[PDB]
């Protein structure tokens, strides 16, 4: 059924699973028109499809041309996400196909269920976790590939860099969610924390800086302080 804090270790077992987040599929800017009405302009988006055990991220870039001449774009975006996830599953060898797909928003359940009717043994599930995957576009190398795309494209990343050499997937996912939550809450301060020290830099083939074990502890503490600092700013605590 739904995925919550009681079955959280299930994310790191040996049953292949993918999270699907559709927040960033249909993105727009809102602006006034010459006549004083309001218009939207779409910008490139992306589907965030992540294996939480391995860190493999299938980033399908959604080019603005897919919306051309279409109506009800917010609805279409869910069905387009489901179509693309279905296509991804069919493209994977059988032994790589997920046994479960967990959608971050309940509105993705029916579109994905309908697109996956041919896969009755893949469970489509919601989650009670509030996961900050919308902040994926705060990761500079991900945002750059999305905004530069001139056509639909799929790009593969490992969102954990090389962390699994040193830590478990439970800890790596916890680190990711903390980083993404901080980037979502105060992007400028999070990037400052992540980039202030110039002696520690991101490898060409990585998304995050090359922190030692001790430095990750320091960074994680600074991210938790940021989140708490912003909570206090928000609620006047």
């Amino acid at each position: 059924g739904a995925m919550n804090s009681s079955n959280y270790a299930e994310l790191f077992n040996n049953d292949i699973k993918l999270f699907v987040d559709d927040t960033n599929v249909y993105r727009v800017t809102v602006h006034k028109t010459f006549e004083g009405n309001v218009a939207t302009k779409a910008i490139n988006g992306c589907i965030f499809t992540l294996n939480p055990k391995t860190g493999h991220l299938f980033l399908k870039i959604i080019h603005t041309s897919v919306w051309a001449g279409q109506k009800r774009l917010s609805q279409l975006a869910k069905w387009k996400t489901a179509e693309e996830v279905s296509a991804l599953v069919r493209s994977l060898p059988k032994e790589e196909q997920p046994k479960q797909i967990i959608v971050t928003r309940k509105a993705m359940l029916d579109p994905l269920e309908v697109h996956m009717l041919d896969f009755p043994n893949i469970a489509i599930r919601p989650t009670e976790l509030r996961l900050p995957f919308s902040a994926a576009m705060s990761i500079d190398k991900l945002s750059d590939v999305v905004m530069k795309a001139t056509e639909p494209q799929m790009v593969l990343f490992n969102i954990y860099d090389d962390w699994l050499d040193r830590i478990s997937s439970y800890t790596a996912f916890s680190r990711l969610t903390l980083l993404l939550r901080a980037l979502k809450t105060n992007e400028e301060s999070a990037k400052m924390i992540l980039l202030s020290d110039p002696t520690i830099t991101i490898k060409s083939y990585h998304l995050w800086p090359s922190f030692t074990d001790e430095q990750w502890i320091t960074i994680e503490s600074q991210m938790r302080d940021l989140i708490l600092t912003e909570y206090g700013r928000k609620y006047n605590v």
């Binding site: 069905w79 489901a82 579109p111 269920e113 309908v114 041919d118």
Partner: protein, 300 residues
């Protein structure tokens, strides 16, 4: 006019005949029902006074044979049987008719209610939903499950309604997932009408039969089928205009006949609010919308 005689009435029972009902006392001199209108299917149904468990009954058409009811003390119910000796049957009916031991089917001449509820219902189609080929009449009860209910358990005692499942490969063409899920016209017109039912009269007959089994027996699977068949039409953008007009008439008479005190268990709020106020056909069921708003505004 035709007659369903009773050998006797050994146990106290509420007897239904179509939309009518009456009580018979234990061992009362009751010998059946006369003046049954020829030209329609009928249902004769039972609820025992000492055990309201299992409503049960029989669908029949007096044009197909001479049927009578006799209580079986071993299986503990009133059973319909067919009398093959026509002369014996005529003689027994005449005797009971002369002794005034039959109730008269109490049809008001102005009243088209039963025709309006059974316009599309045919015995031959009933006998394919309810499979007991050795009898010309069909037994239904409160507890019988549907083929679809059994897939989600004795198959011989099941209601074989046409399975409707909005999230099934039958309902959704590969490549048309969004289209077919948000607009059920393919599933209604190609799969169901052209493919399975052949015409709208057969679809409406099954819809009407499901409603009647829900109302007269409290059969839960029948109520599910009734609502599914309504939702399938209302959720289709493309429906022949004659079908929408006829559906409005069908549903109006069903809502009109429904016992007010059973509305909470016979009407699905989600389906009705969706069909009347959100669906493609939300403006195509004027008569049904008006009776629903005036009789059951709480459901909405």
């Amino acid at each position: 006019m035709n007659t369903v005689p009773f050998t006797s009435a050994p146990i106290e029972v509420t007897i239904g005949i179509d939309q009518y009902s009456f009580n018979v006392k234990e061992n009362q001199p009751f010998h059946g029902i006369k003046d049954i209108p020829i030209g329609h299917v009928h249902v004769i149904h039972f609820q025992h006074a000492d055990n309201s468990s299992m409503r049960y009954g029989y669908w029949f058409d007096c044009r197909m044979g001479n049927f009578y009811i006799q209580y079986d003390p071993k299986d503990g119910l009133y059973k319909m049987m067919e009398e093959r000796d026509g002369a014996k049957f005529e003689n027994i009916v005449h005797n009971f008719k002369e002794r005034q031991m039959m109730v008269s089917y109490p049809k008001i001449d102005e009243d088209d209610t039963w025709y309006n509820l059974t316009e599309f219902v045919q015995m031959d189609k009933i006998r394919k939903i309810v499979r007991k080929d050795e009898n010309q009449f069909s037994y239904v009860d409160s507890s019988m499950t549907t083929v679809q209910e059994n897939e989600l358990s004795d198959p011989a005692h099941s209601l074989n309604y046409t399975v409707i499942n909005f999230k099934s490969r039958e309902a959704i063409r590969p490549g048309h997932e969004m289209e077919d899920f948000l607009d059920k016209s393919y599933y209604l017109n190609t799969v169901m009408l052209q493919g399975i039912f052949k015409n709208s009269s057969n679809y409406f007959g099954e819809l009407q039969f499901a409603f009647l089994n829900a109302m007269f027996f409290g059969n839960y699977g029948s109520s599910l089928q009734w609502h599914a068949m309504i939702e399938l039409i209302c959720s289709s953008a493309t429906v022949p205009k004659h079908m929408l007009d006829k559906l409005d008439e069908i549903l109006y008479y069903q809502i009109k006949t429904l016992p007010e005190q059973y509305s909470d268990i016979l009407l699905n709020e989600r389906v009705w609010n969706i069909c009347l106020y959100s669906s493609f056909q939300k403006n195509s069921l004027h008569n049904t919308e008006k009776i629903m708003e005036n009789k059951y505004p709480e459901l909405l």
